[PDB]
A paper describes a structure:
Functional hLon is structurally organized into homo-oligomers consisting of six identical subunits. Following its [name] localization, Lon’s NTD specifically recognizes and binds protein substrates, which are then unfolded and translocated into the enzyme’s proteolytic chamber formed of the ATPase and protease domains, where they are degraded into small peptides.
Other hLon mutants were produced by exchanging Tyr186 and Tyr394 for glutamates ([name]; Y394E), thereby mimicking the negative charge introduced by phosphorylation (hereafter “phosphorylation-mimicking” hLon variants), or for phenylalanines (Y186F; Y394F), which acted as non-phosphorylatable controls (these mutations were introduced to verify that the effects of phosphorylation were not due to the loss of functionality occasioned by the removal of the Tyr hydroxyl group). In particular, [name] is still able to degrade β-casein, but more slowly, while it loses the ability to degrade TFAM. The stimulation of the ATPase and peptidase activities for [name] has been notably reduced to only 1.5–1.6 times the basal activity, while that of Y394E is still of the wild-type level, although its basal activity is lower. Overall, pCMF186 is similar to [name], but more extreme, while pCMF394 is qualitatively different from Y394E. Cryo-EM maps were obtained for [name], Y186F, pCMF186, Y394E, and Y394F with resolutions ranging from 2.9 to 8.5 Å (based on the 0.143 cut-off of the Fourier shell correlation curve). Tzeng et al. found that unfolded substrates interacted with the β-stranded subdomain through two hydrophobic patches, however Tyr186 is found on the opposite side of the domain from these patches, so the drop in proteolytic digestion exhibited by the [name] and pCMF186 substitutions is unlikely to be due to direct interference with substrate binding.
Numbering used by the authors:
A (entry chain B): 464 to 949
B (entry chain A): 774 to 949
C (entry chain A): 464 to 525
D (entry chain D): 526 to 587
Write the structure that this text describes.
Amino acid sequence: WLTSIPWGKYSNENLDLARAQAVLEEDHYGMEDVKKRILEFIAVSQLRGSTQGKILCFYGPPGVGKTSIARSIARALNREYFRFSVGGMTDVAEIKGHRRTYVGAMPGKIIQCLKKTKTENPLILIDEVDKIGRGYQGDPSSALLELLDPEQNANFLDHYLDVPVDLSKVLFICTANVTDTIPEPLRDRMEMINVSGYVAQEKLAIAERYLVPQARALCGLDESKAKLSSDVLTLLIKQYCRESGVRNLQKQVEKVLRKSAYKIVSGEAESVEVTPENLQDFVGKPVFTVERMYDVTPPGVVMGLAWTAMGGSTLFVETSLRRPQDKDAKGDKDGSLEVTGQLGEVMKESARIAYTFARAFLMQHAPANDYLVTSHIHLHVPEGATPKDGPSAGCTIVTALLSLAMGRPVRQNLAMTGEVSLTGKILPVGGIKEKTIAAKRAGVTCIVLPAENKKDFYDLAAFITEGLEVHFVEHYREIFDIAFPD
Amino acid sequence: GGSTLFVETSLRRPQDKDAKGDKDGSLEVTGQLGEVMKESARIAYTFARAFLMQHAPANDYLVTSHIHLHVPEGATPKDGPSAGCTIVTALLSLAMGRPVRQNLAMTGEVSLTGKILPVGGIKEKTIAAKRAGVTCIVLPAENKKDFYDLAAFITEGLEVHFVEHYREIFDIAFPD
Amino acid sequence: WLTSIPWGKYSNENLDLARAQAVLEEDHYGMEDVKKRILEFIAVSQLRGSTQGKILCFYGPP
Amino acid sequence: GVGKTSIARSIARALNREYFRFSVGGMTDVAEIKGHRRTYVGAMPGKIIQCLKKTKTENPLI
């Protein structure tokens, strides 16, 4: 075990920027930030000699190409590759081996990585960093810190092998679908890159240039026998697949290619020209026949954008009058409110703040409207949004409560996300790009965002912001003139 | 497999504690309820209340009455919320007393407003209903393909009913 | 234990689809999805040559 | 991000006494400070023991 380890053996690293740039572009679509960061890394390493190894993490929805882009980076840089599923782990021993006192004790897994790669400047991937239990007899995060410290990593040693080994030239990648649960000490030490979903156009491009040939090769097929139209892929994306990722699209394309291969072997068509008419037999029938859960937004229900752990979503904040408005015409009782959605205490406080603001705003605008003051109401804000992004539904909550008070439905194909501050001031929120792609995928044409988030919508591409009559606000009153124009 | 579970509702307390009383008609739920299913039961409760208020405003039963509902267990938590429609119709029947139409089954999630979402186990629930001997089955519209992907011999003897909103169901179980 | 292991020994695999389909229909009724999935697996393994191994689960009532 | 760790390093450099760091935050078990009983299979001493071994000094800067 000691001898098989490389010692001073550094894998030759690619340094030409154009070549690695082209490799990354041909192995992947989009991901401009990741490719630019790798180009900066190569430029630094070529401008400072020794092949330093920098740490970073890729945060984004699944089925986006994090493992694939890391593999492409290992390929382009010419350095080796090795991954590790840290998710749900509770035994640090595998990273440190043992004390050597066991029967044939093994070293740490990084020792195995160095042995297999045979070189001391490899690419290492860590998947499900956010899923670490860090429970009893575990706490591997500390070891991870020991690994990811810019200075301590240089003297890393194992329980099995107490000799130190340099981990400064080793490049580290980490992948997660959310940035909150990952430990803060581990969070700070490494930078954080956003690979954020795809719209139908990006998914179609990825499928036609990366998924279809890949699965044809997987199914032992050629570009002539199995033919898929871009229209077929678009229809599949719209109806057979509803998420920000690409994984389910991969499953469907693999299924159709499997059926095509079977039809070629035992069937009659030496080659197949897949079309939607034939897509029905190749896959089945549309699963998501509805673009949205609602299309008119009746009174008391409003669309909102949620930055759930898996990309973005178009949730529907709903309200109902759960008691007769007039128990006693003289009665000056409080219009109690019930809230559902598995809400935390911060969510409950935000709902209370939105309730107070809605009452005040009605009293300012419709003083005779005692509906909100005197009515027992129930609002359901669907869960799924991360707790940090949850308070972004206050704007929805307010407009939905107003609509219920006056009965005026919110404007159709309208989505919003923002945070109220007990007076109407709308604050910036996170997950702007995921929410934008969700709204685009849901048919939203008008979108309301805080002014402070304007940039996170303007830094987006142009083909991701077509038909979105954006509405940038700082105070809630403006929205009342948008959601309720008349 | 699948089963047919009879959701039950009872008035576990006197309706007229005080004629002028404006107290909430609280509801208790049995069936080893999880948090998600408890929230689904609450949502169905409020939806049924609002539905009565709209359809029968003079009916204060669901509002001024303390009720108990039991959903028989066996269903996995994922499929649990599918009984929201059953809960709503059971509460409505207890409110008006009109017994639900016989040989009628239903399953579908509710969204605090009556919109009905697709549910899983369509084939398994269909065979459970067929073995149970029903004729009218209510399913979400979005589940329709999952019911039409079944064989032909597996659907005779029942009149399927597809829906995307609960009002249609109120027009089915309570035709009169 | 080390020597008793089959090293490089691969059980000969049926590849014809008619006979396998008839066998599946003879030994069972229904399960059409499973039967056609096995047919597709055999077709893929035959087209690509080597007897590829694949993972799949059968979920249903006991 | 003010320079507490940096100025502790500077103090260790100036005094010439060795330096070592120990993150006690988010920590529950006392084992990492006092090791183990030496009887548990694969037992380890306290992290301070590792510090004393590494520094090769009796008066380092922890």
